[PDB]
Amino acid sequence: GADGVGNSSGNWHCDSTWMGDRVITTSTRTWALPTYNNHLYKQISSQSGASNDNHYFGYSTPWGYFDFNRFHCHFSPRDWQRLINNNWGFRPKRLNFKLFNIQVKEVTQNDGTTTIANNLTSTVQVFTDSEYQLPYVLGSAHQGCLPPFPADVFMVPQYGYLTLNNGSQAVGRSSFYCLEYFPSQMLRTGNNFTFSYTFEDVPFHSSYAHSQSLDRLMNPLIDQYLYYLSKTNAPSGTTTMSRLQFSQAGASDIRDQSRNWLPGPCYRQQRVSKTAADNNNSDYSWTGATKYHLNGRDSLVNPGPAMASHKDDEEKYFPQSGVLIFGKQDSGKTNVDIEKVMITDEEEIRTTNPVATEQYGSVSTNLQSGNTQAATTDVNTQGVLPGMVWQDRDVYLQGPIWAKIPHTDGHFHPSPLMGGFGLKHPPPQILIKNTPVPANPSTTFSAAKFASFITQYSTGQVSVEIEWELQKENSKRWNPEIQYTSNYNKSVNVDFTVDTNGVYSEPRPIGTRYLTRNL
Amino acid sequence: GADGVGNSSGNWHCDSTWMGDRVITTSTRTWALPTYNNHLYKQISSQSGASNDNHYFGYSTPWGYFDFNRFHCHFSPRDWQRLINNNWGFRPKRLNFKLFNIQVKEVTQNDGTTTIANNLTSTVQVFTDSEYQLPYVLGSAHQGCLPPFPADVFMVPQYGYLTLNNGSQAVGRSSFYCLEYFPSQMLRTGNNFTFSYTFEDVPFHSSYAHSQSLDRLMNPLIDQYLYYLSKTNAPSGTTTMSRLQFSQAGASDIRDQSRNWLPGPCYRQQRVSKTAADNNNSDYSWTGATKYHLNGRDSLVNPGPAMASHKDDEEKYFPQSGVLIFGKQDSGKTNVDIEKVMITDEEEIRTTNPVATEQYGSVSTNLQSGNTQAATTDVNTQGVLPGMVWQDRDVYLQGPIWAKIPHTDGHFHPSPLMGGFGLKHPPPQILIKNTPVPANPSTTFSAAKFASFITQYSTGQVSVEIEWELQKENSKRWNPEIQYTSNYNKSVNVDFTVDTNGVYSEPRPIGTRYLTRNL
Amino acid sequence: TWALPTYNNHLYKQISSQSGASNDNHYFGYSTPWGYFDFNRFHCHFSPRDWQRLINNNWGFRPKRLNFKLFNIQVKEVTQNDGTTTIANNLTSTVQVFTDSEYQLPYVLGSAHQGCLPPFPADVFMVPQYGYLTLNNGSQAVGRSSFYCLEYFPSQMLRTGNNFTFSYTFEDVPFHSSYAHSQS
Amino acid sequence: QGPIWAKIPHTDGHFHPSPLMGGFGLKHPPPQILIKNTPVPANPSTTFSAAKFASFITQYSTGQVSVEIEWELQKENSKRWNPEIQYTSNYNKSVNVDFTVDTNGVYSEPRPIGTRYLTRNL
Amino acid sequence: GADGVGNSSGNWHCDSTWMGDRVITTSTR
């Protein structure tokens, strides 16, 4: 599609369509793109005095990129409620992306007074990295996605990446990418850009909670035909003697029954309380944290493998670094109080996954004998074993959607730990840049590269449409289920609306696990 | 094929052909086969005074076997350089094997003077174990493969195997195999033997190194929208109070960012230095070694799961038993100095795999509270967790190629730990034997089995051709890459050549990971 | 991306060596108001990684054919009122382009001059000015020296919205020897 | 970073016409491409004058240029046994990576790179 | 060509032939 100056190159599409087992969400936003880095590539690195854990080396490019990797970019709160109250699972199917109504504007800063004017002949460059040749920076939970509220205008974030480093320096293996070394399409006002994408096959996300516990799967009315060791000594005349005795497990001793499965793996975290007085009076945010050690550096495990946030009757506690934490509206960046953030809770999976702040279990450490008593120890980290079952972390209305699976020789259960769908060929990155326009050149030749350009930026509309496949529930449960609902009581503001000043805000995080399912 | 005495039954084929995404390597050697065990099967077992860890029971057969399970049996150094400098991966596709120009010769040892003569009517027996019914002894890194230099003549190794043992004795379950109980083809001088084989589907070997680190995958320019616990106490009047505070991770605190993946598993090894003075003055080669315990026996873990050999700026260190160690030319068998061996290095995988001599990470062990401080401990062994990614051990020009996957109920990521391709149906074993020729018998009947034979051996040519599938690199990296190269400076000998005495030698081990790839 | 100024203030000018120059440095010629495009350096076409691929795996190479394109023209007028510069589009102005496909002008490429395309694709470069030398006798000219008016060629005029392309086929040349001899 | 071609001078005789600075000698090299801004006269006088114009509107131009070249390769067919010399990057650490930009955005080429690494018999 | 032990695999050719503007020389050692 291409036409003149006075022709819109696209329309505004924003709604959702529910049809059978599909739902199609399309959203449109308006964006603004500045000139980053003053048209330059720049090598960046960590500060000289930074600790060894915080060293890095990389580059920052003059390009921007579009990002729609959060659920609230596509679902309204009402649409999210429809989804989570009536379906056991869902997954993305295909995607459509469109960029249109481009406007480039030049700025003049004469005498502290700014004048903005159209530049009808300038252009912007766009290309999609459909072969995954650039370092993939999506899927790191960065800011700069499409806003949740359709009436908001957002700035396009700048592209940059990191490569191998040795302290603050680079090594011979580190690679540098010039994004101008890709074929890209140049658009003037009156051109548009589209492409399509098909998701690979992925398992449905489990939008349910189990109505049974992994350790409670037996018939409570019938005993087992297997025996377990129930007593190791028996009373003799005024004393005891070693004597093995066996029993069949029933309901009275349900903890001893033979079982076929084991709970999911574990990697223990430290426990903190939402009540301030319960926590220790010290700075253990890093010393008491759970981390992994890679190439001599320590890195915080956050949020880590999916484990239950707490056991029953203990909502006040949560793992130190084991849950997603969103910020309330207009909360700051650094060292905000607990009233400014929204802490998620993964308690629905405590039917199969162990609690994040307890041990996995206990194993024996010695060989008991006539003169040696049996000894056990706690297991604070347990890799996977044959016979384990577990659930993955839940997804949230304002959480990520997908993540690119790293191209490696091996990987196990490649669902991203922050939640979502792991894809070997995720939706490609979409890079965009204003073409530089040089200022008045000299009338005598000079071989030095240009350094004076016309100050300008661009704006336009972006739309993205995604088809999702649903998995309807088929429960024979008799009593009603738990549903997500709004409270009826009066209040100064309605949730998920704007306030008197025009600020849209999301008052709480919303998971997906409300319906139930048998184990 | 079959013809007379004065007809060659085959030609000499030895070269490589590069065509598109295939490379076909064919090699030919001349072999010599003695008479092993004096035509007998013999039960063998460990010495009576051996330690319990070294007990064994088995048999030695009068058969030999052909082995070409090392890369330098097929690739010249120049061909290996072509492969590793231009491809991201490779794998075997199909195989052709041929045995021809058999000559049997009888030896006479009259009066200390040896006379060798042709025996035109004697024969050799050959068969391929195409149904995997014999114990598979290939894939244990044994000597006796085809020589790397095509002009060398090699002796065929003897076949033998081990079965179940109880100390130095056997058990009822142990099995005994008579190789004469197989259909085999008998060849006189003038017959040849061929067969073909097709490799099953296996993943390409990763001939690249990652240009990104697993803990450095974010955009260093944009903060996350997630929060982490950054401070646990705050200053009060001349004191502190417990108070939780949260921050959004950026580049300044990059170690705290939320991430989607975890490094590969770990099994910690002891660290030793190539500088003699750095190591302890004691004998810790066995006491300080990492081992596994199976049926009451301890067995050294060598080389074990793939972990990085060292962190940056520490080339002098290497895990005690975590790397492949090749010997230099003409180095001895027992207790040679470090200058006689070539120690490999797996540093290219420290972007995803933990260092072999460090802990995997740290986990909390208790529950902090108003009067209890948080405590952590190191994790020295970590089984696989959902969300882990890792690389496999590299392959080398003089290392093994494949290994037979044991026929068991379960196995996880069945790539052999010494490196290479794991096959459920590997290339079959090829057994060969000289047919016994009895000496002058008595003229009166005797039921005792024969014990006097004509001393003889055999020789001939062997050829093997393998097709390999290549995976070409498609990088958009701007700066040049690292390549394997020869040094230009003058020297007394050229590498990978013969010396003044005719001895071919390989001066260093050569891996495959030179090109780079994004994570 | 390129930028083209107005050279010589739209004039042709006779140029010559200084009066006091040594005899070895005398010259006579002209400078034209035209610019010219130049891509006669290898790094205009090969990235360092591409150059490495070439030289590590091939014994020789040579060019075969060529495609050239000029597009997205923008003409801008400058106003220097009161030391303050204002730049604006001039939608109706044009640029002239032509290729000397019959080798009738003095060929100044192939003298290792600056002004080629930059090696890094993100750089913006200025188009160099065209000029040539002819026969001279000291600082003066002779009757044999020739003068070329470039407006005396058919050229294509482009407004913003027009583009210019052409194609070219290299003649047969021997491969460049990308090897070293292993014998003396 | 060296030249590619050079035009062979149109003369009666020449010997081995490969340009001495290196590259390919062509009798019909890629043609020159000339470009110029068309002059736009400024405000003229309202009474006729035969003198040529001397006042123009100050202006310049900008745009994009693209060039595509096809190259024919000659693959090596060596039977050499030992490995060859290849161009490679050094692995050791450094403040900047070669053939990249620095912290200020300046691209630089740290060394000249020839073509003669593979070997051939005489 | 291939045969047994008691078969010559070739003959002795050694002479020259002059015909017009050609000359064919064959030698055996």
Author numbering:
A (entry chain I), B (entry chain K): 217 to 735
C (entry chain H): 246 to 429
D (entry chain H): 614 to 735
E (entry chain F): 217 to 245
Kindly provide excerpts from the paper associated with this entry.
Adeno-associated viruses (AAVs) are non-enveloped ~25 nm viruses that encapsidate a 4.7-kb single-stranded DNA (ssDNA) genome. The AAV cap gene encodes for three capsid subunits, VP1–VP3 that assemble into a T = 1 icosahedral capsid at an approximate ratio of 1:1:10, respectively. VP1 contains a unique N-terminal domain (VP1u) that harbors a phospholipase A2 domain, which is believed to be responsible for endosomal escape. VP3, the major subunit of the capsid, establishes tissue tropism via cell receptor recognition and antigenic response by the host.
We found that AAVv66 contains 13 amino acid residues that differ from AAV2: one within the VP1u region (K39Q), one within the VP2 domain (V151A), and eleven within VP3 (R447K, T450A, Q457M, S492A, E499D, F533Y, G546D, E548G, R585S, R588T, and A593T). We obtained 52,874 particle images, which yielded a cryo-EM map at 2.5 Å resolution, and obtained a structural model with optimal real-space fit and stereochemical parameters. Overall, the AAVv66 structure is similar to AAV2 (root-mean-square deviation of atomic coordinates = 0.456 Å). Of note, VP1u and VP2 domains are each represented at approximately a twelvth of the VP3 domains for each particle, and similar to other AAV structures before, were not resolved in our symmetrized cryo-EM map. Therefore, only residues 219–736 are definitively resolved within the cryo-EM map, including 11 of 13 AAVv66-defining residues. Key differences occur at the interfaces between monomers of VP3 at the protrusions around the threefold axis. D499, whose mutation to the longer glutamate residue resulted in dramatic defects in vector genome packaging, forms electrostatic interactions and/or hydrogen bonding with S501. Here, the backbone atoms of D499 and S501 respectively interact with the side chains of the symmetry-related N449 and T448 amino acids, whereas the hydroxyl group of S501 hydrogen-bonds with the backbone carbonyl of the symmetry-related S446. Our observation of the strong effect of D499 mutation is therefore likely due to the disruption of the interface between VP3 monomers, leading to destabilization of the capsid. The polar hydroxyl group in AAVv66-Y533 (AAV2-F533) likely stabilizes the polar environment between the side chains of R487 and K532, and may contribute to the interaction with L583 of the symmetry-related monomer. AAV3b’s physical and functional interactions with HSPG rely on electrostatic interactions conferred by residues R447 and R594 (R447 and A593 in AAV2), but AAVv66 also lacks these arginine residues (K447 and T593). These differences from AAV2 and AAV3b suggest that AAVv66 associates differently with the canonical cell surface receptor commonly utilized by AAV clade B and C capsids, consistent with our findings that AAVv66 lacks heparin binding.
